[PDB]
């Protein structure tokens, strides 16, 4: 009956931002008390509702997205900003309601010497609307040219890896970020509160 958020947070594997994973979690009881009582969560953003009230104000439907990005822009993932990740990899809607959680996991993902196993879209044809996991891998172009699918003058791979190394600094350390998006409909609910 319990909502497997702790699954997502304590999940062994996380995806890259461009391939940000989505969970249509529902029909379970939520324990956000477990969430905001975490000592782990260095950052805890919430927009549209106090993390206090979620425990006892309950929703039609919820989405739990997750991905991995370098630490400092954790607040790029916010309601209505422009920027690298906001524009081309993940954009919350201006009228977004939900929360943003993250934490450092150098012990998990940082590897001595070299790691490059997380990706983010480097540049795209047009801005990304809210909520589209656009797994698009064809070589982006920026002009009048036959891309020919081959790198060169202008047409470039749209995705770029990371450099998560333990010997690097806190702003650049890999933070695993979970986005709790919320949605209400002209429909019955699926998640609610205790005692």
């Amino acid at each position: 009956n319990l909502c497997p958020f702790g699954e997502v947070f304590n999940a062994t594997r996380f995806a890259s931002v461009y391939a940000w994973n989505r969970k249509r979690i529902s029909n379970c009881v939520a324990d956000y008390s477990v969430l905001y009582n975490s000592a782990s969560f260095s950052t805890f953003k919430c927009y549209g509702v106090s993390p206090t009230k979620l425990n006892d104000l309950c929703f039609t439907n919820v989405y739990a997205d997750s991905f991995v990005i370098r630490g400092d822009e954790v607040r790029q993932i916010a309601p209505g900003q422009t920027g690298k990740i906001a524009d081309y990899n993940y954009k919350l809607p201006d009228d977004f309601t939900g929360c943003v959680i993250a934490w450092n996991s150098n012990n998990l993902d940082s590897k001595v010497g070299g790691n490059y196993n997380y990706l983010y879209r480097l540049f795209r044809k047009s801005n990304l609307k809210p909520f589209e996991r656009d797994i698009s891998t064809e070589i982006y172009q920026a002009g009048s040219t036959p891309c020919n699918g081959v790198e060169g003058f202008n047409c470039y791979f749209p995705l770029q890896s990371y450099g998560f190394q333990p010997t690097n600094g806190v702003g650049y350390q890999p933070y695993r970020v979970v986005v709790l998006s919320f949605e209400l409909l002209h429909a019955p609910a699926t998640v609610c509160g205790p005692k």
Epitope: Y36, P79, G80
Partner: antibody, heavy 129, light 112 residues
């Protein structure tokens, strides 16, 4: 795209009350915390006041504490300023600004926005006798 | 608690890497609160430049890259050109009975 424009500025004698404002467009204005910031010419621009997304939470700088009134109508989709006990040094340009919405924090306490994304065009206040 | 200390102005050859620092108090920056830097041209609207300690919003093409330390912050203009000539403000929250603090103001200066 979002557009913010100020209005109501002018030359005012020190001491009397005044009403500034700023109209909003291009974004869900009702659910963003807004800010008013000061810039004396040639001097560093400084924060004046910040209004919660719902207008419930308000914060003024110390130098402007009490003398100033912030207000805003979600339905009207705009932001207002009420001026009491003006002073000459406050002759400056005033900017209405939008940043990321004020996130509620863990354990429930509100937090004001930490930075400003877009700005109004600006209004002038000349607190001069 | 204090105003974020800034240099008055700095200079650099066009297109080379230069830096601006910004220092704060324990209750100012080292408490954990982050910085952001704005620019504005003389007598113009202020525009945000780098809000994440090292992230760029759109229209901030490149050459702008922030940082973080224990108690100091820095932007590198890795390549400057007269379009960058403005004054730049380092803004960070304060936990000293205050809200957001704004830098004194630093002028970039290209060689004549």
């Amino acid at each position: 795209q979002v557009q913010l424009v100020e209005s109501g500025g002018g030359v005012v004698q020190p001491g009397r009350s005044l009403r500034l404002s700023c109209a909003a467009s291009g974004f869900t204005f009702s659910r963003y915390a807004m800010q008013w910031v000061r810039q004396a010419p040639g001097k560093g621009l400084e924060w004046v006041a910040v209004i919660s997304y719902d207008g419930n939470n308000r914060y003024y700088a110390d130098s402007v504490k009490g003398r100033f009134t912030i207000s805003r109508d979600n339905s009207k989709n705009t932001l207002y300023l009420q001026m009491n006990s003006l002073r000459a040094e406050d002759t400056a340009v005033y900017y209405c600004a939008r940043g990321p919405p004020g996130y509620y924090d863990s354990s429930g306490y509100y937090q004001t926005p930490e930075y400003f994304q877009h700005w109004g065009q600006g209004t002038l206040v000349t607190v001069s006798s | 608690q204090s105003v974020l200390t800034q240099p008055p102005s700095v200079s650099g050859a066009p297109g080379q890497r230069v830096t601006i620092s910004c220092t704060g108090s324990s209750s100012n920056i080292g408490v954990g609160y982050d910085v952001h830097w704005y620019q504005q041209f003389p007598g113009t609207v202020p525009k945000l430049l780098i809000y994440g300690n090292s992230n760029r919003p759109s229209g901030v093409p490149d050459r702008f890259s922030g940082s973080k330390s224990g108690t100091s912050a820095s932007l590198a203009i890795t390549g400057l050109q007269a379009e960058d000539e403005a004054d730049y403000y380092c803004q960070s929250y304060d936990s000293s009975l205050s809200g957001v603090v704004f830098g004194g103001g630093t002028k970039l200066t290209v060689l004549g």
